[PDB]
Design a protein around this ligand. Sequence first.
Ligand SMILES: Cc1cc2nc3c(=O)[nH]c(=O)nc-3n(C[C@H](O)[C@H](O)[C@H](O)COP(=O)(O)OP(=O)(O)OC[C@H]3O[C@@H](n4cnc5c(N)ncnc54)[C@H](O)[C@@H]3O)c2cc1C
Ligand SMILES: Cc1cc2nc3c(=O)[nH]c(=O)nc-3n(C[C@H](O)[C@H](O)[C@H](O)COP(=O)(O)OP(=O)(O)OC[C@H]3O[C@@H](n4cnc5c(N)ncnc54)[C@H](O)[C@@H]3O)c2cc1C
Ligand SMILES: [Cl-]
Ligand SMILES: [Cl-]
Lengths: 429, 433
Amino acid sequence: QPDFDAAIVGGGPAGSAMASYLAEAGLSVAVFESEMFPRPHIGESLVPATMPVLDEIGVMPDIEAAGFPKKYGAAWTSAHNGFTGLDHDFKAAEVMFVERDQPGVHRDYTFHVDRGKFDLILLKHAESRGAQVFQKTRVLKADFTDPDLVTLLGPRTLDFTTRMVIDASGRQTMLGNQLKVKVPDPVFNQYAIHAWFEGLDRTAMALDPAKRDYIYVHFLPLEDTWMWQIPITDTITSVGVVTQKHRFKAASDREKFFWDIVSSRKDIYDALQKAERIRPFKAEGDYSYAMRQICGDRFLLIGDAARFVDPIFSSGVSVALNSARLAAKDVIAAHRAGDFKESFATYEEKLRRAVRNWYEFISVYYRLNILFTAFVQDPRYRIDVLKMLQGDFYDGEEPKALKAMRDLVTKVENDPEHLWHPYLGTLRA
Amino acid sequence: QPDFDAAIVGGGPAGSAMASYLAEAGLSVAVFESEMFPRPHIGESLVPATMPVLDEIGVMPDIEAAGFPKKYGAAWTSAESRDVPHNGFTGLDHDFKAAEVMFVERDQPGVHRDYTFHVDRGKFDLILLKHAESRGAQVFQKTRVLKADFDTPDLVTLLGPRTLDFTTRMVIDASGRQTMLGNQLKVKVPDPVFNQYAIHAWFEGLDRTAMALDPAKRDYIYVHFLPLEDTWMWQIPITDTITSVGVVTQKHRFKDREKFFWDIVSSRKDIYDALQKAERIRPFKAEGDYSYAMRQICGDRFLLIGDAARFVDPIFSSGVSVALNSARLAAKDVIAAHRAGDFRKESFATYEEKLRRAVRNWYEFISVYYRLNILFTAFVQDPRYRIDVLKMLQGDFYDGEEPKALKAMRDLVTKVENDPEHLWHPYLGTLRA
Ligand SMILES: Cc1cc2nc3c(=O)[nH]c(=O)nc-3n(C[C@H](O)[C@H](O)[C@H](O)COP(=O)(O)OP(=O)(O)OC[C@H]3O[C@@H](n4cnc5c(N)ncnc54)[C@H](O)[C@@H]3O)c2cc1C
Ligand SMILES: Cc1cc2nc3c(=O)[nH]c(=O)nc-3n(C[C@H](O)[C@H](O)[C@H](O)COP(=O)(O)OP(=O)(O)OC[C@H]3O[C@@H](n4cnc5c(N)ncnc54)[C@H](O)[C@@H]3O)c2cc1C
Ligand SMILES: [Cl-]
Ligand SMILES: [Cl-]
């Protein structure tokens, strides 16, 4: 007599994807979302590992019809020790996703996206495939009896019953907090400040005007600080700064600080000065964490609710989408067999490994800093580095690039006369 | 203490607009919507009387950013092939096979633009409903109101496997064609004359120039009438590439809706052939029993707006403007009633009187179209009447004083009806009861 077979907390990319998979499989599914869509949300530039999932669940047409800017590649700018391919020294690197064959991907492009629209399309698509979706409905607790009662809408409180809970709460980590298994990263503590601008000329930063719809990461000449530049429409562009919380606390105000930091680079500063900010400044903080358990009897965690690290590689949505995919296979087998913790270990193992790679790849980047440019551009490393940049880490093998980069960061770190020793970033793992 | 000052049943254009007005004004407001948005919905081509309301409530930017096709004008064509006596009328550039308009030909108060829009109602209603939330309203989707209990503040009885109650001082029924209170209170009256039936779908890749007078007019709404059968078909842009196409006919004819749709479209080769090159991107839906009125549209602690209060026939694309402007007028009364602490029926008579009148104009204007179509054509095209008739076609029927053109039409239809040897008597149309 439970209301649902599964209940999903949160309707972002993880939640919507999960529900859509579960409904196609024949389960009674509910999705609870405390907001009303469309709702603004950070995390806009996708990587091609999103696409197989979006195809599989049958939403690509609806995505294609939305008119999001296509993303053909990614670029880095800023302002040799045997490395080559460096046509522009360390002021520019570029890569195109099609340079490497990626399994499950048959296109040249993915998308940069207004998350408001993007999440709405996935959430309505979940409804079209059978899921019961409940907006402005906040889940307060999962009370663990033979099912779970979820306790939840305006002045009214209501309960619903499920055999299984799936936490897709993102950074609000509902069950992570409820069960007290959330662990903040002992090193990463970056802080993001961002906004949307209209009329920035994306040709400014572009070496070649065909590449101006790439994502641009702009390294700044401070410690562990950079900026993103992401197309949202022809005319609107999402810009954000990322730095250490300590820097932000070392200073005194969100706007003033954003511009101060951007002021470290004249060209971009002036370029942004030609634009009109179309949205208030929002901040993201305390977002690097993991969980000691990501599953238990009658629950599991997907998307940012299970982990998040740092958005330097634009992979968060692909992780949310692919964690949903993997978790579905386990939830479906558990439902059929009538048995909901150890039922979820395959999902756990495959996500632990996947996310270790992303993590370890990010730690290198920060130690490497600007030297990272060299690995994009040098052809011994370019294609391996691109595997990671594609979001492709759901494989047995340890990525070859991560080994090479780690080994090389070590040798540089230990040797104070190494040509690159002065260019090391200052955040370590 | 009640949960809300007002509670609104339905989140379409009437509901969303009402809520946004009420929140601006400082009331605690709730909107209940049984569906999840975006949801498909018929009724796509707007008239310029929508715009003042959309501006006033502060949602034009968000509409503008949606990229809806702009609507600069409309065309009403007729399959009439008999040689018809001009009977003194002029401007008949296309004889009696076509009449057309550009909304900017008349200055309309509150309107400063050249265009309105044709719209995906899915996206359009979402933007209004989220905008209402932005301005303060509490919105509850997939929440069905089953009854308004008035016998003890009203409790509204209502979400998945869960039933819940909420409290309000005042109920506003914006249920559209599901006429929640109209049915609950048994005050709904089907029209004794009208019951047309619509079949429609979306197509991708149609050349909109096919049906068009010329390819500059490709963006207009086109309605093609067969006056000897009270049957017509419409062509409404939805994107560059998607177009909404529909047929409207008498229910009795309808008593396999795909076959019928094509038969009716086949009456015009150009479009038929053009439609053959297109891809139907949505299933055929059918919209019926849509013409009705209500004996009461207000009472103690309730009132009805939009289609929940009345609907006639979509020939002039006015339904959304009526829903938006009824919301506007009803807000004034609801706001004054709230401030004075008095929601008795009589508090709402200004709204009632203005809407009775407004809607009587629309109604009588529609009857003429069906009953003597060539007359409709001649009045749109003739400069004695053109500008007054355009006022009505703009959706502007809330200032009151009877439009002069409508009176002249009525009087002329009478004379023709009574005289069987009047030159136009053989063109009078005929709707089955
Ligand atoms: C290109 C890119 C750039 C990115 N940049 C950044 C960045 O700059 N900063 C950053 O911090 N992250 C960033 N991310 C990561 C991203 O913003 C999210 O952390 C994550 O990737 C989204 O996955 P999700 O759907 O699981 O989370 P969400 O999309 O947040 O899913 C949670 C949703 O469920 C709802 N919800 C949450 N809790 C409850 C509850 N208790 N009851 C009911 N509903 C609830 C919320 O409305 C929320 O929208 C980025 C990701 C990408 C791909
Ligand atoms: C064939 C056809 C063509 C049309 N063409 C046009 C056109 O070209 N241009 C134009 O302007 N107009 C047109 N209309 C009219 C237009 O569709 C309606 O007038 C318009 O939708 C009215 O808005 P509303 O908010 O009053 O009702 P609706 O838009 O119908 O919204 C009412 C909402 O109430 C909700 N609801 C929530 N709770 C309940 C409950 N308990 N019971 C019932 N409902 C509930 C429903 O889900 C619905 O979303 C057309 C109508 C038809 C039939
Ligand atoms: Cl990320
Ligand atoms: Cl209408």
